[PDB]
Write an enzyme that holds these catalytic residues in place. Structure first.
Site, PDB file in Angstrom:
ATOM      1  N   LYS B 157       0.821  -1.209   0.000  1.00 54.98           N
ATOM      2  CA  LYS B 157       0.000   0.000   0.000  1.00 54.98           C
ATOM      3  C   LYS B 157       0.857   1.262   0.000  1.00 54.98           C
ATOM      4  N   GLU B 183       0.861   4.743  10.863  1.00 58.27           N
ATOM      5  CA  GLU B 183       1.890   4.171  10.014  1.00 58.27           C
ATOM      6  C   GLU B 183       3.224   4.139  10.756  1.00 58.27           C
ATOM      7  NE  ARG B 184       6.521  -1.032   8.501  1.00 60.38           N
ATOM      8  CZ  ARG B 184       5.358  -1.533   8.109  1.00 60.38           C
ATOM      9  NH1 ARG B 184       4.351  -0.754   7.753  1.00 60.38           N
ATOM     10  NH2 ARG B 184       5.203  -2.854   8.070  1.00 60.38           N
TER      11      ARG B 184
HETATM   12  N1  LIG Z   1       5.472  -3.093  -7.135  1.00 57.12           N
HETATM   13  C1  LIG Z   1       6.353  -3.615  -6.272  1.00 57.12           C
HETATM   14  N2  LIG Z   1       7.606  -3.879  -6.704  1.00 57.12           N
HETATM   15  C2  LIG Z   1       8.495  -4.383  -5.844  1.00 57.12           C
HETATM   16  N3  LIG Z   1       8.333  -4.681  -4.555  1.00 57.12           N
HETATM   17  C3  LIG Z   1       7.089  -4.409  -4.153  1.00 57.12           C
HETATM   18  C4  LIG Z   1       6.061  -3.887  -4.922  1.00 57.12           C
HETATM   19  N4  LIG Z   1       4.910  -3.738  -4.163  1.00 57.12           N
HETATM   20  C5  LIG Z   1       5.265  -4.167  -2.974  1.00 57.12           C
HETATM   21  N5  LIG Z   1       6.566  -4.593  -2.899  1.00 57.12           N
HETATM   22  C6  LIG Z   1       7.304  -5.101  -1.753  1.00 57.12           C
HETATM   23  O1  LIG Z   1       6.358  -5.345  -0.725  1.00 57.12           O
HETATM   24  C7  LIG Z   1       6.642  -4.533   0.432  1.00 57.12           C
HETATM   25  C8  LIG Z   1       5.848  -3.264   0.271  1.00 57.12           C
HETATM   26  O2  LIG Z   1       6.154  -2.374   1.363  1.00 57.12           O
HETATM   27  P1  LIG Z   1       5.086  -1.343   1.894  1.00 57.12           P
HETATM   28  O3  LIG Z   1       5.645  -0.447   2.925  1.00 57.12           O
HETATM   29  O4  LIG Z   1       4.449  -0.622   0.703  1.00 57.12           O
HETATM   30  O5  LIG Z   1       3.976  -2.285   2.498  1.00 57.12           O
HETATM   31  P2  LIG Z   1       2.467  -2.129   2.975  1.00 57.12           P
HETATM   32  O6  LIG Z   1       1.537  -2.977   2.214  1.00 57.12           O
HETATM   33  O7  LIG Z   1       2.149  -0.635   2.971  1.00 57.12           O
HETATM   34  O8  LIG Z   1       2.562  -2.554   4.482  1.00 57.12           O
HETATM   35  P3  LIG Z   1       1.756  -2.385   5.833  1.00 57.12           P
HETATM   36  O9  LIG Z   1       0.546  -3.254   5.821  1.00 57.12           O
HETATM   37  O10 LIG Z   1       2.752  -2.719   6.933  1.00 57.12           O
HETATM   38  O11 LIG Z   1       1.417  -0.889   5.880  1.00 57.12           O
HETATM   39  C9  LIG Z   1       8.130  -4.267   0.295  1.00 57.12           C
HETATM   40  O12 LIG Z   1       8.787  -5.500   0.557  1.00 57.12           O
HETATM   41  C10 LIG Z   1       8.255  -4.031  -1.207  1.00 57.12           C
HETATM   42  O13 LIG Z   1       9.560  -4.466  -1.548  1.00 57.12           O
HETATM   43 MG   LIG Z   2       1.709   0.746   4.628  1.00 57.68          MG
END
Ligand SMILES: Nc1ncnc2c1ncn2[C@@H]1O[C@H](COP(=O)(O)OP(=O)(O)OP(=O)(O)O)[C@@H](O)[C@H]1O
Ligand SMILES: [Mg+2]
Ligand SMILES: Nc1ncnc2c1ncn2[C@@H]1O[C@H](COP(=O)(O)OP(=O)(O)OP(=O)(O)O)[C@@H](O)[C@H]1O
Ligand SMILES: Nc1ncnc2c1ncn2[C@@H]1O[C@H](COP(=O)(O)OP(=O)(O)OP(=O)(O)O)[C@@H](O)[C@H]1O
Ligand SMILES: [Mg+2]
Ligand SMILES: [Mg+2]
Lengths: 475, 469, 53, 483, 120, 128, 120
Positions: B157, B183-184
């Site tokens: 996200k 968020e972090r």
């Molecule tokens: N399009 C992409 N290309 C490469 N890696 C991706 C992509 N989308 C996600 N990732 C990988 O997945 C993770 C995404 O990190 P991110 O901070 O966006 O997570 P999140 O879904 O927001 O997490 P949370 O639920 O903790 O908020 C990282 O490991 C990133 O490397």
């Molecule tokens: Mg996030």
């Protein structure tokens, strides 16, 4: 006025009349020498959580006030001995020395003081070092099932620091804290024996809120260990803390909350649980040179069930950490140890802090191994692509308690990536690796000093290592 | 004089205050408790009787003592607004944390306000080009609309929102607000770091974004009102400055989650699976504020965490209704290595209608979804009995769907380190042409491998040529 | 020759089909167990909430 | 003492008030700060009052004063073309509301004797519903389905289709419309009113807009007051169709009220009287006796469901209460079946008695054909060389399901649907390649509109088929099938 | 019905639609009186109230009562407590299935599902 | 039965059907407002069934030869042996005679499933 | 067992059959005390109850108390809180099987499903 009298007690909870001057979460001490935290104030009474066993209190007892919020002794005086929560010494070696006392629940540092991670936590595990690097100040989850080696991943990392904590300067040092929550006391005893058989105990701290402790001690212990580590952080020395494991902390907090009759939430965990972990894990950070310079780094452990990373607590914790390592049980019993599931294992910042030489040689090896997985599920070249993957999956394996210095990892990863191992018999790879390092130790050793000291391969050294690997392959 | 009370009860984030005189603080007023660690701010939430009021505390309630004096501010929580907030990081209760001096402006405004009157509501069908293939193809966004990213833990996200920022905000001409909610802290610091390096903020000069933050380390009381604080910043630009606002809110689930944290202590009977009784209307009083009025546009992106990946959960279920478009991220796609992991079936958009997107585009998207659904229907038979048994045209459809699915992947610049592949943006007409061409059956001779992570069909053929070499 | 080859290929293919059928049986047993625990907890909490006021 | 009270406590839009010894249950009251409210708890020492507005300006010790009159709403023809809140106050800003009278919200539903059975259609113009799931005047038909599966679109198409008759002078055939938006975001109401105005349906539509910004009780009252509006048409001797979008969003608001009132929770933390609530709402749909002008009120409640599981409390209750169900599914929506109606589950108890008679004979065994097709649809994947009969069923069933595709906001008069279903049933389109079916449906109508106008004109005017008319349509279809 | 049975001595054929909604109304009233919800929300008294209603229908020496009862079956789950409780009280049960009607068979009695103690 | 047991007669008891007994016990428990448990049965229903079932016995000749034998009868919703009350009963009992709807439909009457039914103790007592 | 360990000195085996019903009894006790039930009906104190029971059996100066514990598994699922909690403490596991005995192997230990953390 100052001291109250007990009205009720049971389930580890008590209610006390009086205590008119008590701060919220201040430590009361009972007539029997047990201590409790004033958790729930109300008009005319204070609800208190006993850290000790319920048997230790009676109605009509007279309760003293400590005058301080929950706090721990801090500083290097703790270094090298086992402590229970509230800083109680249990190693039988005598009283704790302290540089000071700090509240167990200080607020995590704000947005501005932090710096993005740019230094490596030297793993000692090949797969972790190359594929999911961990940077100082990052938070990397270790998640797995029973007996799938969750402790080993952290224990090898703790031992590996031996080569630097003995070093000439504080620059590279990394002090270690290990927190056992709800574990068998025999497990803590044997693990301490392991860390004392090696030199590690000279520089590490053990927090041992084991299974027999009443729920509030298990709930509180991680915060106290973090508050110990934060002293090292704030005095400009790097600190690594490990938790085996935060799921049992969640269970302890569930028990404590339900006995307080707070509403049960999703999966019967209290709705507050998200806060419990987060306000812990956010306390790991790396502080910019403007306010000291140092880091607290965290390796929490989570025990899944049947690999269900989608369960409530796993996902909840994953929402907080900057990365995850998922130890697949199938790979463990397939014999592929430490069984890192490279597809789901993730480091969200480590690639920006990996030791440069290892990245330089690895060259996108992560996607390469994911491709090997994609192939292995089932053109002649597509078949050939699997052979080097098989070599690599043989080479990533490592036995417990025997780390590799980076100077040893780099040649092996280089040989695996460039394909010079593809011609070698797959089953003999374990003989090759131990042999190749020996060759590096005997003939090319200067190259091993260069790779270790410089942090990058020069193009001249890239060609030199290609020549050396091809030569040893010719042997 | 200002009117004073005494604390009588303290539980977690909740505090009960008793006023000796019949003078009484109105609900939602802000109360200040002096303490050596800096003033504690509390918000009035209920009246219990006998001049007793129940309030939510916004710092750690440790150190409070029964009988402490409490001082009424005479109004609700308020924050500074106006252009001077740009280039600054603002706490939930208005103090800066960027350590660049006190923020001062002609006006503050209160946290709580009624959402816009119906008579001023506005609608427009100005499709917004993101540069993301799957989004622009199957679920377009709208200027001034509300769009939501749904996903489990760790599916992408925040990276997705940062890619959206890199594509959209650069020269939007309007003013932007970014609000961190649970968020972090690392996420906020990294966002600030990257922005100072890309001209969106300037410690010396002028800036285009205002930052409001309360992260996951803060107690639930602040995590509740921080979203309303950022919203109050946005509304002033909407209604007073008159400039189109790019509003980014991550993570908004933490809002209602925060409410649940207090719900038990306020003494509500818990709803299903422990959520607030006020879930619907408490969400509403926040969400309805964000809509675009006749006075000016608010283009808003909301990040929606899904607990346990369970979209039947009351929180996301209540959240979907309040949005015009929603992109759903799912873990299964991530496990298969496809990123940015958009689920191409469940992602839906108000704008996917023949009248507004173009007939050719709409037809292409419909057929793409039909193909993907066919594959998803066959996968069970394929898994058990095996791909050999498939009917000829069904087998061709499967081999085509697999190509399209892996073609919907895309490398963002923000993931440049993760993928090792340079980030690439795609023109929308190019996306329509590409997926049309693939559904015409031109490219079944290409190996499937070629479609993985390239920006457009021409890049697919170029990668096929490079692969064959 | 073709008849014998067809029979042998059928034998192999449907042995593999039974393999994958067993794999799905395992995964759905695990998912059933998880849903069992989830359903029991979810239903129980309703009784608790009703009784707790 | 008796006619006034003092606020003892306030929170979450609910207040506990002392005194008011003469208050009637559900009575409306006023707070001196200007807020109005409704009494729902009566205890020996206090009155529980839920608020029609923000509590930010209510305080302990406020004086509260009775009003005596129970919740009521304005009614009349002036409401047409206007958007009104839950209590009937104007919100579109166009001006005052030309009320003909008033009516209380809670009202007895018509008794057993005054009613007569359904015998008139509500031609939705939605081809699949008219052909397969009839809806008659006085019927109550649930629309139930998953998140974002066209539930609103179905009702909106049904509303838009009435433009044909509503523009004429056939008073008996008219059908006024009331749309009750509850829990929706306000800009959705703005978009919907713009969409209706763009099609000129606003002339005959009333909109109630208790959107999710409103304090919870206003959502609760929003359907009932709307019902009291619709009944004024019914009691006056006219036809009105009321749509509720959606009653589950309302059940959530009632759950909030009940929990804050501390009424004992039921299953899934809903109040125990939910079924009584929706019964009191929906039983008001009826067609009156000739004694009372033969008017009618028709209801289309909408129920969203999570993951399609109807086992939940509210969907089960509403399924029990209603006369029939239209089930919408994401599977059908994605694989190309729009409006994505699950034919198998969509029973309607009025059935053939409701359809305009022309369509009855034409559709005929259509249900049997689709139901038999569903039986072999899964078997088809076995790859066996199935017999010519099952193959005939399998080849037609999908090609006929294809004919029930339809464009959004494009309702078809039954004049048009009869040729289509006739061709689909008699198999005259059996030889057409599947992708061309959508072309055929488009072209065939045009052909009949160009060269056989006196046949479509009779399909309207006669409203029924004969052997000669069927034969003529046969001739036209046989000629057209050869291009 | 019981007046015709006991006093007139006449045999009575009694029809009820729908007893499942009798159980549902019992649930509503029990919840409103504030009793603790039982399994899946039905009233604790479900067994005793259903028995109190059903046993009155029994035949005595002076005249018989024959009864036909309809149960709505939520989500077709015959094992739900509300319909499941009634199996203890019926001489014959006739499960109707919409799937049979889909095949064009009316009145759509599931031939293998029905039971009758008099089939002897 | 115990009067016959202790006096040296031989007795058999049949409980049709203990599921309804558990239902009555939960009705009493909930109307007494006692703590509910899993499946909305009172937490000690296991004790309810065990206190009764353990009265089945054979006395020693020194005590006075006599026996009480028990045949619990259970109604199994959808054949779910894992349901709470059947689970407790099976944990208490010495074996099962397990009837099945499938087999009764197939015309196997009295429709015993031989595979699922087992008699741990009785195999020592079948006629020689 | 403890008295033999600490006051006599010899090693001891403590056989517990069956630990699952210790968990069941704990759940009944906690329910009766009014402690609101936790996940899938087991009591909140499950973890610390098991700790208080099993933490005592360990090595000391004089000797040790080893314990063979028979484990019933509800629904034969190893993720359920009772066996899951138990397995957090177990050192090794022995699996008997009727099939192994039928093959003529006595005692009928499964040599591969049996697992020991001390195989080190
Ligand atoms: N399009 C992409 N290309 C490469 N890696 C991706 C992509 N989308 C996600 N990732 C990988 O997945 C993770 C995404 O990190 P991110 O901070 O966006 O997570 P999140 O879904 O927001 O997490 P949370 O639920 O903790 O908020 C990282 O490991 C990133 O490397
Ligand atoms: Mg996030
Ligand atoms: N590198 C390794 N190579 C091979 N086997 C290993 C390795 N590391 C650990 N093991 C095996 O795992 C055992 C230790 O497992 P460990 O305690 O790390 O698992 P765990 O998942 O933490 O377990 P628990 O839930 O009991 O704490 C070692 O005794 C050895 O059996
Ligand atoms: N006949 C149709 N053909 C094509 N697209 C359609 C058709 N009917 C509806 N849609 C599209 O499907 C979606 C239906 O939206 P709608 O608001 O009607 O959903 P809903 O199920 O009522 O959702 P909610 O529960 O959020 O109110 C919109 O994208 C609409 O454009
Ligand atoms: Mg471990
Ligand atoms: Mg809708």
């Amino acid at each position: 006025n100052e001291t109250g009298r007990v009205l009720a007690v049971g389930d580890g909870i008590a209610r006390v009349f009086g205590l008119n001057n008590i701060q919220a979460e201040e430590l009361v001490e009972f007539s029997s020498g047990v201590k409790g935290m004033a958790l729930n104030l109300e008009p005319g009474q204070v609800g208190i959580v006993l850290f000790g066993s319920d048997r230790l209190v009676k109605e009509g007892e007279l309760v003293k006030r400590t005058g301080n919020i929950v706090d721990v002794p801090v500083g290097p005086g703790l270094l090298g001995r086992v402590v229970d929560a509230l800083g109680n010494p249990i190693d039988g070696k005598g009283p704790i020395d302290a540089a000071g006392r700090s509240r167990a629940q200080v607020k995590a540092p704000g947005i501005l003081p932090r710096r993005s991670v740019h230094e490596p936590v030297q793993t000692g595990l090949k797969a972790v070092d190359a594929l999911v690097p961990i940077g100082r100040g990052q938070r990397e989850l270790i998640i797995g099932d029973r007996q799938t080696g969750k402790t080993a991943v952290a224990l090898d990392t703790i031992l590996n620091q031996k080569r630097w904590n003995n070093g000439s300067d504080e620059s590279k040092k990394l002090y270690c804290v290990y927190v056992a929550v709800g574990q068998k006391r025999s497990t803590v005893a044997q693990l301490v024996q392991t860390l004392e058989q090696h030199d590690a105990m000279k520089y590490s701290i053990i927090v041992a809120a084991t299974a027999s402790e009443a729920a509030p001690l298990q709930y509180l212990a991680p915060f106290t260990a973090a508050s110990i580590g934060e002293w090292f952080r704030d005095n400009g020395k790097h600190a690594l803390i490990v938790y085996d494991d935060l799921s049992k902390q969640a269970v302890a907090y569930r028990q404590l909350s339900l006995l307080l009759r707070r509403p049960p939430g999703r999966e019967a965990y209290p709705g507050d649980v998200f806060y419990l972990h987060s306000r812990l894990l956010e306390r790991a950070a790396k502080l910019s040179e403007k306010e000291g310079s140092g880091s607290l780094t965290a390796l929490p452990v989570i025990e899944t069930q049947g690999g269900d990373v989608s369960a409530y607590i796993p996902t909840n914790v994953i929402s907080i950490t900057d990365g995850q390592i998922f130890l697949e049980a199938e790979l463990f019993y397939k014999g592929i140890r430490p069984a890192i599931n490279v597809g789901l294992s993730v480091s969200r910042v480590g690639s920006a802090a990996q030791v440069k030489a290892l990245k330089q040689v690895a060259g996108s090896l992560k996607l390469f191994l994911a491709q090997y997985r994609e192939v292995a599920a089932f053109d002649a070249s597509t078949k050939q692509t699997l052979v080097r993957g098989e070599r690599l999956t043989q080479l990533l394996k490592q036995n417990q308690y025997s780390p590799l210095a980076t100077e040893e990892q780099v040649p092996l990863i280089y040989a695996g990536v460039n394909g010079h191992l593809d011609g070698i018999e797959l089953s003999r790879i374990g003989e090759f690796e131990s042999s190749f390092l020996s060759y590096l130790k005997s003939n090319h050793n200067e190259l091993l000093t260069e790779i270790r000291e410089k942090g990058e391969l020069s193009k001249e050294l890239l060609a030199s290592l290609k020549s050396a690997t091809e030569s040893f392959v010719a042997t | 004089t200002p009117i004073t009370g005494k604390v009588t009860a303290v539980i977690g984030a909740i505090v009960d205050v008793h006023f000796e005189q019949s003078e009484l603080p109105a609900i939602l007023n802000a109360l200040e408790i002096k303490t050596p660690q800096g003033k504690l701010v509390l918000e009035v939430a209920q009246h219990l009787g006998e001049n007793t009021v129940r309030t939510i505390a916004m710092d750690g309630t440790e150190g409070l003592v029964r009988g402490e004096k409490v001082l009424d501010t005479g109004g609700p929580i308020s924050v500074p607004v106006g252009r001077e907030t740009l280039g600054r990081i603002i706490n939930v209760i208005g103090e800066p944390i960027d350590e660049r001096g006190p923020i001062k402006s002609k006006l503050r405004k209160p946290i709580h306000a009624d959402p816009p009157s119906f008579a001023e509501q506005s609608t427009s069908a100005e499709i917004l080009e993101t540069g993301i293939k799957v989004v622009d193809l199957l679920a377009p966004y709208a200027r001034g609309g509300k769009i939501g990213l749904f996903g489990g833990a760790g599916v992408g996200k925040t990276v997705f929102i940062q890619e959206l920022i890199n594509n959209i905000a650069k020269a939007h001409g309007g003013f932007s607000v970014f609000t961190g909610v649970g968020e972090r802290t690392r996420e906020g610091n990294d966002l600030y770091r990257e922005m100072k390096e890309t001209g969106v903020i300037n410690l010396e000069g002028e800036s285009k974004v205002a930052l409001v933050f309360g992260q996951m380390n803060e107690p639930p009381g602040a995590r509740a009102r921080v979203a309303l604080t950022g919203l109050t910043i946005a509304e002033y630009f909407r209604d007073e400055e008159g400039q189109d606002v790019l509003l980014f809110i991550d993570n908004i689930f933490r809002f209602t989650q925060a409410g649940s944290e207090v719900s038990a202590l306020l003494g509500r009977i818990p709803s299903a699976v422990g959520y607030q009784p006020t879930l619907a209307t408490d969400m509403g009083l926040l969400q309805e504020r964000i809509t675009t009025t006749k006075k000016g546009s608010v283009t808003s992106v909301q990040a929606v965490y899904v607990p346990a990946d369970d979209l039947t959960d009351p929180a996301p279920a209540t959240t979907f209704a309040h949005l015009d478009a929603t992109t759903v991220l799912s873990r299964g796609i991530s496990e298969l290595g496809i990123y940015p992991a958009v689920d191409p079936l469940d992602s839906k958009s108000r704008l996917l209608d023949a009248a507004v997107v173009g007939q050719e585009h709409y037809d292409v998207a419909s057929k793409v979804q039909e193909t993907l659904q066919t594959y998803k229907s066959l996968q069970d038979i394929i898994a058990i009995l095996g791909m050999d048994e498939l009917s000829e045209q069904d087998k061709l459809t499967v081999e085509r769907a697999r190509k399209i699915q892996r073609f919907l992947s895309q490398p963002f610049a923000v993931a440049e380190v993760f993928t090792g592949i340079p980030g690439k943006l795609v023109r929308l007409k190019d996306t329509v042409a590409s997926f049309k061409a693939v559904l015409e059956g031109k490219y079944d001779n290409i190996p499937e491998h070629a479609f993985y992570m390239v920006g457009g069909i021409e890049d697919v053929v170029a990668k096929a040529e490079k692969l064959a070499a | 020759q073709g008849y014998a080859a067809e029979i042998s290929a059928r034998r192999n293919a449907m042995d593999n089909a039974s393999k994958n059928a067993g794999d799905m049986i395992n995964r759905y047993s695990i998912l059933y167990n998880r849903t069992r625990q989830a359903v029991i907890t979810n239903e129980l909490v309703d009784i608790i909430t009703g009784a707790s006021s």
